[PDB]
């Protein structure tokens, strides 16, 4: 119906909770399903409806050249604040409300071409945050390698919930 380059003129677009709407819905839903399948999750953790219902922020990377220059969304990164009880390196149990990575996916055939990096760098600047100051919801092996090799985040501080944080968090 619309070319994506017309809906999203920027290479990386930011959506809050405000999502023409049916086309935007389809794009986000398909990407969310792809991410959850990649992670062997029982259901999508990212969808258009969930975006509308939550206070999350979704970054979408568009390859403007694809589909005869009409554009295709090739990856997304979803972040949001979560209230968390966390343990520091000495075992002090601290209440915190960090910005968290909640979902993150680049189309499998397009991985390892820097798209994840572009999304993550854009978000850090946009949110005015450094990677060590964030929490990570159940990060996968691929994402942990990404964080170690590109952002020097290694040897996380063990938590009892499913969130991961690194030394510089504290
Ligand atoms: C909290 C959560 O969101 S948990 C869910 C995380 N998402 C997933 O597991 C979904 C499946 N995985 C993905 O979609 C991707 O692997 C992502 C989004 C994590 C990374 O996106 P990509 O576009 O592939 O990352 P990008 O190309 O920018 O990689 C940057 C660096 O990260 C490291 N890296 C990325 N993938 C890997 C990997 N599979 N193995 C080892 N290192 C990797 C490399 O150092 C890479 O640089 P190099 O390619 O020059 O070696």
Swiss-Prot record:
Q: Which reaction does it catalyse?
A: L-lysyl-[alpha-tubulin] + acetyl-CoA = N(6)-acetyl-L-lysyl-[alpha-tubulin] + CoA + H(+)
In the UniProt annotation, what is the result of changing residue 112 to E?
Reduces activity to 19%
Q: What happens when the gene is disrupted?
A: Morpholino knockdown of the protein causes developmental defects at 48 hours post-fertilization (hpf), including cilia curved body shape, short body axis, hydrocephalus, small head and small eyes. Morphants often do not respond, or have slow startle response, when probed with a needle, consistent with neuromuscular defects.
Tell me which domain of life the UniProt entry assigns to the organism this sequence originates from: Eukaryota
Q: Which residues form the N-acetyltransferase domain?
A: 1-170
Keyword Cytoplasm among UniProt keywords: yes
**Chief location of this protein within or outside the cell:** cytoplasm
Binding annotation for acetyl-CoA = 104-117, 140-149
Give the UniProt record's GO annotations in the biological process aspect. Answer: alpha-tubulin acetylation; microtubule cytoskeleton organization; neuron development; regulation of microtubule cytoskeleton organization
Its Enzyme Commission number? 2.3.1.108
Q: Which GO terms describe its cellular component?
A: axon; clathrin-coated pit; cytoplasm; focal adhesion; microtubule; spindle
Site feature: Crucial for catalytic activity: 39
Record's keyword terms, sorted: Acyltransferase, Cell junction, Cell projection, Coated pit, Cytoplasm, Cytoskeleton, Membrane, Transferase
One GO MF term attached to the UniProt entry: tubulin N-acetyltransferase activity
Q: What class of enzyme is it?
A: transferase
Where is this gene product found? Answer: Cytoplasm; Membrane, Clathrin-coated pit; Cell junction, Focal adhesion; Cell projection, Axon
Q: Give the family, as the similarity comment puts it.
A: Belongs to the acetyltransferase ATAT1 family.
What is its quaternary makeup?
Monomer.
User: Any idea what job this protein has?
Assistant: Specifically acetylates 'Lys-40' in alpha-tubulin on the lumenal side of microtubules. Promotes microtubule destabilization and accelerates microtubule dynamics; this activity may be independent of acetylation activity. Acetylates alpha-tubulin with a slow enzymatic rate, due to a catalytic site that is not optimized for acetyl transfer. Enters the microtubule through each end and diffuses quickly throughout the lumen of microtubules.
Protein name per its UniProtKB record: Alpha-tubulin N-acetyltransferase 1
Q: Can you name the source organism?
A: Danio rerio (Zebrafish)
Please state the gene responsible for encoding this protein: atat1
Region of the whole protein represented: 4 to 184 of 297
């Amino acid at each position: 119906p619309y070319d994506l380059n017309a809906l999203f003129p920027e290479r990386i677009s930011v959506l809050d909770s405000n999502l023409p709407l049916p086309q935007v819905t389809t794009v986000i839903d398909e990407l969310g399903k792809a991410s959850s399948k990649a992670q062997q999750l029982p259901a999508p953790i990212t969808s258009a409806a969930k975006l509308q219902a939550n206070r999350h922020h979704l970054y979408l990377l568009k390859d403007g050249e694809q589909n005869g220059g009409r554009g295709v969304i090739v990856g997304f990164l979803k972040v949001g604040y979560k209230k968390l009880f966390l343990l520091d390196q000495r075992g002090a149990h601290l209440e915190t409300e960090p910005l968290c990575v909640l979902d993150f996916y680049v189309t499998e055939t397009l991985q390892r071409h820097g798209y994840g990096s572009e999304l993550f760098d854009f978000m850090l600047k946009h949110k005015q945050v450094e990677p060590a100051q964030m929490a990570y919801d159940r990060p996968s092996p691929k994402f942990l390698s990404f964080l170690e090799k590109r952002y020097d985040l290694r040897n996380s501080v063990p938590q009892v919930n499913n969130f991961v944080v690194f030394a510089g968090f504290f």
